[PDB]
């Protein structure tokens, strides 16, 4: 249904638009290809929510965008986004906001996270 409408508020309060309109397009995505999740704002922060649960997080970093579904999506994968060219955390992955995310690599772990999770 509805959830720009959460989210849209947050958006307008980065104060820094050079790089702000990478972290919409994640926003509308995970909206499309996901939409078993449902929106919260919860911590100032993005996340959603299939039916409450916590399998998607987010927020804007002062130079990069720190994205992961829980753990597991920095346990396994992280090897396969080390050698796509990008960093993480062990609790998150951060692509910097001059490079492109990789949609592709984020959607594997979700979408397995939410299968897993029956």
């Known amino acids: 249904?509805?959830?720009?409408?959460?989210?849209?508020?947050?958006?307008?309060?980065?104060?820094?638009?050079?790089?702000?309109?990478?972290?919409?397009?994640i926003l509308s995505w995970?909206?499309?290809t996901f939409p078993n999740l449902e929106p919260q704002m919860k911590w100032n922060?993005?996340?959603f929510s299939n039916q409450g649960t916590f399998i998607i997080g987010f927020s804007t970093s002062k130079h990069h965008l720190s994205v992961s579904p829980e753990e597991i999506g920095i346990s396994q994968f992280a090897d396969a986004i080390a050698q796509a060219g990008y960093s993480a955390?062990?609790?998150?992955?951060?692509?910097?906001?001059?490079?492109?995310?990789?949609?592709?690599?984020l959607k594997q772990?979700?979408?397995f996270n939410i299968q897993d999770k029956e």
Request: hydrophobic share 35%; no cysteine.
């Open 89 to 105: 955390t062990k609790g998150l992955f951060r692509i910097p906001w001059n490079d492109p995310v990789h949609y592709e690599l």
């Open 30 to 32: 995970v909206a499309a």
């Open 45 to 47: 922060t993005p996340m």
């Open 1 to 25: 249904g509805s959830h720009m409408e959460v989210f849209a508020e947050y958006l307008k309060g980065i104060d820094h638009p050079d790089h702000r309109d990478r972290t919409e397009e």
């Open 109 to 111: 772990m979700i979408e």
